[PDB]
Design an enzyme around this catalytic site. Structure first.
Site, PDB file in Angstrom:
ATOM      1  N   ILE A  17       1.431   7.537   7.129  1.00 49.26           N
ATOM      2  CA  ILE A  17       2.084   6.407   6.481  1.00 49.26           C
ATOM      3  C   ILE A  17       3.227   6.856   5.584  1.00 49.26           C
ATOM      4  CG2 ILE A  17       1.773   4.546   4.831  1.00 49.26           C
ATOM      5  CD1 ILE A  17      -1.076   4.223   5.846  1.00 49.26           C
ATOM      6  N   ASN A  86       2.005   8.214  -2.471  1.00 46.78           N
ATOM      7  CA  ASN A  86       1.284   8.074  -1.211  1.00 46.78           C
ATOM      8  C   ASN A  86       0.223   9.169  -0.967  1.00 46.78           C
ATOM      9  OD1 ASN A  86       0.984   6.957   1.619  1.00 46.78           O
ATOM     10  ND2 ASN A  86       1.738   9.019   2.103  1.00 46.78           N
ATOM     11  N   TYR A 152     -14.427   7.646  -2.889  1.00 45.71           N
ATOM     12  CA  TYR A 152     -13.097   7.172  -2.499  1.00 45.71           C
ATOM     13  C   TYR A 152     -12.780   5.809  -3.145  1.00 45.71           C
ATOM     14  CZ  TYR A 152      -9.135   5.634   0.351  1.00 45.71           C
ATOM     15  OH  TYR A 152      -7.901   5.199   0.778  1.00 45.71           O
ATOM     16  N   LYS A 156      -9.638   4.507  -5.797  1.00 46.19           N
ATOM     17  CA  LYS A 156      -8.701   3.432  -5.534  1.00 46.19           C
ATOM     18  C   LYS A 156      -8.788   2.343  -6.595  1.00 46.19           C
ATOM     19  CE  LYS A 156      -6.558   5.286  -2.216  1.00 46.19           C
ATOM     20  NZ  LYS A 156      -5.185   5.822  -2.476  1.00 46.19           N
ATOM     21  N   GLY A 183      -5.408  -2.073   4.685  1.00 50.47           N
ATOM     22  CA  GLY A 183      -6.773  -2.348   5.078  1.00 50.47           C
ATOM     23  C   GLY A 183      -7.209  -1.129   5.861  1.00 50.47           C
ATOM     24  N   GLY A 187      -5.279   6.055  12.860  1.00 50.43           N
ATOM     25  CA  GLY A 187      -4.762   7.398  12.710  1.00 50.43           C
ATOM     26  C   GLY A 187      -5.800   8.307  13.339  1.00 50.43           C
TER      27      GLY A 187
END
Lengths: 256, 256
Positions: A17, A86, A152, A156, A183, A187
């Site tokens: 991304i 990112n 994780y 976030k 969402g 990948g």
């Protein structure tokens, strides 16, 4: 040319991304910096994109690497207009199996990295005297907890929190801080992730990735191209009045 | 006696809100553990509360200290029915003034401490075979960010997230995980905190503590007695169907 004559620093943009945003940003007439911990891949991608992109080594977990990165770009560009945090890491495991190494690592990069990278660039922007745009990358995971993604998810959630705090604090200097919450994005990582869930939930190899993509209201797993529009919009003056927000671009996966 | 015959480990309970919970739980017929990093204070409060309370040294940022505390309590009680993660640190500073040192501690104690302390006790509860109750201490700061409280807000946002992930993952073992989110609770510590804001926002010494108190819908600043009712309730069987929630007990300061 929605970003004509502007400079953007995108962390962890050697692949995925991050790379997409870089390509999109360049396409809009902006100069981008492909920052990554591995200078090999960085130079590769930067050369692949063109004269508008340049590579630079960056370890968001190391203050020294951070200060070097910012100081160097400041001399090459004279000013950093846009910053896109990112760089991130993913991992999963139930509560009783979480390790100190998983915790230590994800928070160091996802949280700590985003925060101090924001601080470094914000200090420059304030000095520059002409504001700037900062975009953080959250995720649906940061909206609600999950049984096997405790660490994780928590990172976030922290990113969303920091975006609000930075947003309210930096807007006085003309710096807009907002975040994008993807969402489920496809990948290669989905090969192993799927294996993980398959093993953790007694599911056939490949069923998890199938279930997930079919559960998305829109009807399919995400794609980098679904995110670039918002990545660009938040950096334009048509968004000058958007402060401390986290916008979900997940095909309906989560509603905020 | 609503908590008759039960045991509860309360971290950072030598003073403040943690001590109010311990005194309240003891009143409901429970045995409690005054865990604190300073054994001197811990012993003092335990002696003060009575034969039902015992003291024990605990440093939630050290795995060794964590394992020793649980093991010792398991030998003394045979099982830990309730765990209240009350230990935490507060701090404030604008984005451009946040230090690595400030970040490191708060996350170490507020987040890391809550997570691994949860994991240790959960493991024991699962092995116990009869479930249990876990209560984390969140804060309004975890609901939305603030300009001068970036670090602290981020840690509490991560707590709310961890409470959800654990709640969903551990409910299958008969373990209820929920959190309480206080608003502005009065304290002496407010002396310095007020000074901080007064200096950071050009305000008369003492105006900040006044403004905050007057802004609470209820009409006054929080008190430890305001929180004990919810602390007890969430540990009784009348709350067995309550999973992964964060209940605000803030006099209306924030609505969820």
């Amino acid at each position: 040319m929605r970003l004509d004559g502007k400079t953007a620093l995108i962390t962890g943009s050697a692949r995925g991304i991050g790379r997409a945003f870089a390509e999109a940003y360049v396409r809009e007439g902006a100069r981008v910096a492909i920052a990554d911990i591995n200078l090999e891949a960085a130079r590769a991608t930067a050369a692949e994109i063109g004269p508008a992109a340049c590579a630079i080594a960056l370890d968001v977990t190391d203050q020294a690497s951070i200060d070097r990165c910012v100081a160097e770009l400041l001399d090459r560009w004279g000013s950093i207009d846009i910053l896109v945090n990112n760089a991130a890491l993913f991992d999963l495991a139930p509560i009783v199996e979480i390790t100190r190494e998983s915790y230590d690592r994800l928070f160091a990069i996802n949280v700590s990295g985003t925060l101090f990278m924001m601080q470094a660039v914000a200090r420059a922007m304030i000095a520059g005297g002409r504001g700037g745009k900062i975009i953080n990358m959250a995720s649906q995971a940061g909206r609600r907890g999950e049984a096997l993604v405790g660490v994780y998810c928590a990172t976030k959630a922290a990113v969303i929190s920091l975006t609000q705090s930075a947003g309210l604090n930096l807007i006085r200097h003309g710096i807009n801080v907002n975040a994008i919450a993807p969402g489920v994005v496809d990948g290669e990582h989905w090969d192993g992730v799927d294996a993980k869930f398959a093993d953790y939930e007694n599911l056939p190899r490949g069923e998890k990735k199938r279930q997930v993509g079919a559960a998305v209201p829109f009807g399919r797993m995400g794609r980098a191209e679904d995110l670039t529009g918002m990545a660009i919009f938040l950096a334009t003056p048509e968004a000058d009045y958007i402060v401390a927000q986290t916008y979900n671009v997940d095909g309906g996966n989560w509603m905020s």
